[PDB]
Structure 1
Amino acid sequence: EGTFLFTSESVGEGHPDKICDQISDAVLDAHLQQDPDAKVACETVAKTGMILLAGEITSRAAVDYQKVVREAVKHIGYDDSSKGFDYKTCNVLVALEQQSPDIAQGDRNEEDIGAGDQGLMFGYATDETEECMPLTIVLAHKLNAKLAELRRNGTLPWLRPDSKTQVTVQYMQDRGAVLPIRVHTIVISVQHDEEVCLDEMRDALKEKVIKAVVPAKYLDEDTIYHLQPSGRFVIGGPQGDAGLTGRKIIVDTYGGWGAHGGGAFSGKDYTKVDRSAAYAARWVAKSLVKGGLCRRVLVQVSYAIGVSHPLSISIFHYGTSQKSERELLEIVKKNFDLRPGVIVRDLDLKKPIYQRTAAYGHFGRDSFPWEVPKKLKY
């Protein structure tokens, strides 16, 4: 037939894994506000009544970690025992040292600073949406964003921060391109208070959330809706659970499409090529699709610690381009300088913009420089 199903997941800000991501990037932004050259590698752990920060920081900034964390938890929305977590009374432990001096040494100009680590990173784009992202992860992200929006404007006051969404879309293949046909299944689980009744929640999730996010041409009579499938969900977040920074990296990127090199984003400054090179790889892929050179493209780059030039660069257009992959590679080499010291300059990665990225996806939102396509010259 040539038709397949694909599912992508997205979680809300209250998910324990995402709490750690946002806190880690909140610590990063705090240092960057005072020291644009701060070295930050801040991991976060969240369990019952605890937030723990562990990692390495080299900064001239004076940061109040107790208040940075508690304001992030407050922003996420956990302010009472009835929700399972409260920023006012939770335990905050800090185990932050200085960056390894062996790491810092391995003193040089801005344009050929070596990568802070080895690693491989992927970039991906697809013309199936105007965001150049897969429809499954775009819909999953926007659904969690609509839940938080309706929670914060008081129109659905029974909502709570923890949530998880899964969107299954039926796809058609066409010479390497993918055509979304219909939404097969939507799953939504969201934390809620004790007063609201189950049936009222499920109807509100369909009329006020799904219908407000999913275009009507993808929903039909056979679409399956799994709304609050586990029944009650009064307590969520870190209570009775455990979350870690960088445990939602597929949620953070392409929701299972493309490829992933394993590196996590949150809590890492721009010198960590896990973040800066992944943002640049998305920049390249989106510029190739928006520029009309392909319908769907995957990009890989890799680095070695202390070396500035990428060790390998590869392009794959899935057969959606008239031009061969090698000349796509040259168009990239002529338009992009993928050294980490040049990426930070081109993408303006010293700004405290990273707490915004820790939820609803790092890719597919016009607010970010790596999402603005580059006018290609060749």
Structure 2
Amino acid sequence: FQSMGVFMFTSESVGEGHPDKICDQISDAVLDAHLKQDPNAKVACETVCKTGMVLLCGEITSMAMVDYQRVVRDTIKHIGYDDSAKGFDFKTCNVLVALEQQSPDIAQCVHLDRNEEDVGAGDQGLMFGYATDETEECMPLTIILAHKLNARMADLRRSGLLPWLRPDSKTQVTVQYMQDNGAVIPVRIHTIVISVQHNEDITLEEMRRALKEQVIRAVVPAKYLDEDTVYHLQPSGRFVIGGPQGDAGVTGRKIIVDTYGGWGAHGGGAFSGKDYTKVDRSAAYAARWVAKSLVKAGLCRRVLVQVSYAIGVAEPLSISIFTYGTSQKTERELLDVVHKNFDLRPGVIVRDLDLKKPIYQKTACYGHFGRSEFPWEVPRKLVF
């Protein structure tokens, strides 16, 4: 039918040892370490990585006494970089620290002498939330599948089923969709790409078989895979050099992997290494929570929420709701529903979503959205 308007859409994800993701995990491990001692820590920790080097850079004002060497090295250990053969080793890498206090000019307008409920936005910016009824967790299939493919390789690396696997990995999933009055419905997998760092002992043919049979067929529902699905498995033919040795990594360079995989929209701000006063994080989280709550209320099938802030001002400047033609109520009526049911000041968001809890390292690989353990993934019951 013409109404089905068949289309392709692609998303990617990366694994725990991808150098950009190493940085996000380290930045969030530093955040967590601070929050365990000082729940009101002001943290803006950037991490940069390259061969043999982790650099911490940014601004922290906190009463915590944090051993940055240990936090960094424990994180790299967890990811799996523990020997020179792998290109990176937690035991023997350089950890360099260039951390200062938060600017007093920022402190004075954001939080100094303020009541927590009316804490100012930590910066200006725009943030989006997105939800789709296409999966139970209200996320695009493309991004969820991409994440799970990386998680599966990590699981098989750690169990020793595929002991040639190294931590740096990338995946990409192209799904063929149909549409239904603005809603989207996955039909089949059009193309899958997987690139993963590996040892020098395993053959290409063996790696390719394992990637199809033990990774892809374990993760992707069988109904979506068919004879015409295209597989680009270890397309480079060789990925021995990997991690920070293959590619310099930086915090906040996987913004789209972290969120919706190309769906919805993004305001530009990174999540990792930032406490709740940074609306780049807290408001993006709340926006996701709003979007998901609207879908789970049965008020729409798909929705994009935009919010924005000025530095030092608690109240959002603007909130906008876009439902892709999938709501019976108007977008203006839904904005009234959101105003009646949510308070998107960061000092209220912190309460609703428990954002001083040291769970941030868990968010920094495999996506900040879609996973059931995070508070912004528990829909709020709406009155309307």
Scaled to the shorter chain, the TM-score interval is over 0.9
Classify the secondary structure of the residue corresponding to 1:185: strand
The count of corresponding residues between Structure 1 and Structure 2 is: 378
Q: CA RMSD in A?
A: 0.8
Conserved 8 A contact 1:82-1:235? no
Conserved 8 A contact 1:137-1:167? yes
Q: Of 312, 319, 326, which residue of structure 1 is paired with 2:318?
A: 312
Q: What are the Cα deviations for residues 72-128 of structure 1, in whole angstroms up to 9, with x where unaligned?
A: 111111111111111111111000010000100011212111111000000000001
Q: After superposition, where does 1:194-209 map in structure 2 within 5 Å?
A: 194-209=200-215
Q: Of 105, 108, 131, which residue of structure 2 is paired with 1:105?
A: 108
Which structure 2 residue ranges, 5 or more long, are not aligned?
none
Alignment of 1:8 onto 2:11: yes
Deviation of 1:169 after TM superposition, in Å, equals 0.4
Q: Name the residue aligned to 1:257.
A: 263
Q: Of 174, 178, 182, which residue of structure 2 is paired with 1:172?
A: 178
Classify the secondary structure of the residue corresponding to 1:212: helix
Deviation of 1:290 after TM superposition, in Å, equals 1.0
Alignment of 1:276 onto 2:282: yes
Q: Name the residue aligned to 2:304.
A: 298
Q: Name the residue aligned to 1:353.
A: 359
Deviation of 1:48 after TM superposition, in Å, equals 1.1
Q: Hey, what's the Cα distance between the residues in 1 that align with 2:93 and 2:303?
A: 45
Q: Which amino acid aligns with 1:250?
A: I
Q: Hey, what's the Cα distance between the residues in 2 that align with 1:65 and 1:14?
A: 19
Conserved 8 A contact 1:115-1:305? yes
Conserved 8 A contact 1:117-1:272? yes
Alignment of 1:191 onto 2:175: no
Q: Hey, what's the Cα distance between the residues in 2 that align with 1:240 and 1:163?
A: 12
Alignment of 1:82 onto 2:88: no
Q: Of 37, 40, 45, which residue of structure 2 is paired with 1:37?
A: 40
TM-score by length of 2: 0.97
Runs of 4+ in 1 over 2 A off after TM superposition: none
TM-score by length of 1: 0.99
Q: Hey, what's the Cα distance between the residues in 2 that align with 1:233 and 1:274?
A: 34
User: What percent of counterpart residues are identical?
Assistant: 86
Q: Hey, what's the Cα distance between the residues in 2 that align with 1:193 and 1:77?
A: 13
Q: Of 342, 351, 361, which residue of structure 1 is paired with 2:348?
A: 342
Q: Hey, what's the Cα distance between the residues in 2 that align with 1:143 and 1:367?
A: 20
Q: What are the Cα deviations for residues 232-289 of structure 1, in whole angstroms up to 9, with x where unaligned?
A: 2112100042110000000100000000000000000111000000000000000000
Q: What are the Cα deviations for residues 180-213 of structure 1, in whole angstroms up to 9, with x where unaligned?
A: 1110001101111111111111111111111111
Q: Name the residue aligned to 1:331.
A: 337
Q: What are the Cα deviations for residues 160-195 of structure 1, in whole angstroms up to 9, with x where unaligned?
A: 100000000011122111111110001101111111
Q: Name the residue aligned to 1:235.
A: 241
Q: Name the residue aligned to 2:56.
A: 53
Q: Which amino acid aligns with 1:52?
A: L
Which structure 1 residue ranges, 5 or more long, are not aligned?
none
Q: Which amino acid aligns with 2:364?
A: A
Q: Hey, what's the Cα distance between the residues in 1 that align with 2:246 and 2:356?
A: 37
Q: Hey, what's the Cα distance between the residues in 2 that align with 1:311 and 1:82?
A: 52
